[PDB]
């Protein structure tokens, strides 16, 4: 078992979040510096997010060790994932939600049904807290519990593009992001993100409390913003490049507006409708936790 430090698990060098960029392992904050925003005539205003349902989906009797981190990160940023609701293994998180369960969540990101040798795993209390909210990824598809998938992206916009004045106001102009870019930039970004051990980020987000929690939100804000960025490119209505005198500026439009597109494109990862419901639910839960 891996002890959780006074800071989150994310404080450990083992869980560094870093996209590739300019031939080096850039941290997300120093990629997001590259991002620049063209405000347009439209305005995003953030509605209150509905409280996530109390219900935790049943973890059906599953003998196997479900690879959950892979499932989640693929559902959010996977290039090729689809029908992320037909399998319904996200419900498995609920198995961890019980006090004193024999199950453990490995750093590998797999949910073992019993503690097992030579497999490091998160402190069960923290994971219990994390499962108590994120098991609800299991009802991302269930009709009674589906998240809004239009309104929520306003928050994404505000947390990604929004200036501190806009984030304070709760309203920003709809923005059109851009950055100097390499060939296939959004894909490689999305995959550098897919490899991230986000379970660390989530477990710290759910277990930490008090000042130590708030210090997390600031330390990890740019990471969360990168996930929000990959996701926003996934739903961005269009994504062009611009010639800029022997340089190329990738331009995704627009931040905070889910176009609900499902047809694929070479430029970015694409959400099937199931992935839209899933990402919506994930955003609902994670944003609900990011504001408290």
């Amino acid at each position: 078992m891996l002890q959780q430090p006074t800071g989150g698990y994310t404080t450990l060098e083992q869980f560094a979040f870093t996209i590739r960029n300019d031939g080096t392992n850039a941290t997300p904050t120093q990629f997001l510096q590259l991002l620049s925003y063209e405000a347009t005539e439209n305005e995003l205003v953030k509605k209150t997010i509905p409280t996530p349902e109390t219900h935790l989906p049943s973890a059906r009797n599953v003998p196997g060790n479900v690879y959950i981190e892979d499932a989640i990160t693929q559902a959010l940023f996977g290039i090729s994932a689809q029908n992320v609701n037909a399998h319904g293994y996200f419900s498995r998180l609920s198995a961890l939600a019980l006090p004193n369960t024999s199950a453990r969540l490995g750093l590998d990101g797999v949910i073992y049904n019993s503690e097992t040798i030579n497999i490091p795993f998160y402190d069960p209390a923290a994971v219990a807290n994390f499962a108590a909210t994120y098991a609800k990824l299991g009802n991302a598809s269930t009709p009674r519990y589906r998240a809004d998938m239009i309104d929520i992206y306003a928050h994404v916009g505000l947390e990604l593009a929004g200036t501190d004045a806009e984030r304070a106001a709760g309203v920003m102009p709809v923005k059109r992001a851009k950055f100097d870019s390499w060939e296939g930039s959004l894909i490689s970004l999305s995959r550098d993100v897919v490899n991230w051990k986000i379970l660390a980020f989530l477990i710290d987000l759910c277990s930490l409390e008090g000042e130590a929690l708030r210090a997390f939100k600031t330390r990890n804000r740019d990471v969360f913003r990168m996930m929000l960025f990959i996701m926003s490119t996934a739903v961005a209505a269009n994504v062009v490049n611009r010639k800029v005198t022997k340089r190329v500026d990738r331009v995704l439009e627009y931040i905070g507006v889910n176009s609900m597109r499902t047809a694929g494109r070479t430029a970015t990862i694409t959400y099937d409708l199931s992935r839209h419901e899933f990402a919506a639910k994930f955003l609902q839960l994670t944003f609900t936790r990011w504001n408290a």
Binding site: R20, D70, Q74, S188, R191, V194, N195
Partner: protein
């Protein structure tokens, strides 16, 4: 010329410790690295807390790699069998309202 060259003079000179101009294979030829969660191939991390550099990102060739492959347990593309059950009465079949 010989942009394609990897090794040269795999022999040992009896006087000097290495032949002049003999060249070892690039280290990248031997870093199998890892298959990432994305299915992208990565070279081994050069330090702790560093992710591996993806192999497609850079121009060096890498002659060992982790290919995922399905086992005998999988089998895709085989024909599969089903029982088909016709509706009992044609006039009982509904169209609208769906």
């Amino acid at each position: 010329i010989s942009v394609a060259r990897s090794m040269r003079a795999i022999v040992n000179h009896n006087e000097v410790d290495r032949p002049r101009g003999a060249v070892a294979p690039s280290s990248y030829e031997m870093d199998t690295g890892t298959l990432s969660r994305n299915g992208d191939l990565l070279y081994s991390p050069v330090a702790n807390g560093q992710v591996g550099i993806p192999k497609l990102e850079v121009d060096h060739i890498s002659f060992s790699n982790v290919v995922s492959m399905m086992t005998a347990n999988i089998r895709t593309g085989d024909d599969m069998a089903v029982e088909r059950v016709n509706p009992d009465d044609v006039r009982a079949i509904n169209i609208r309202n769906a």
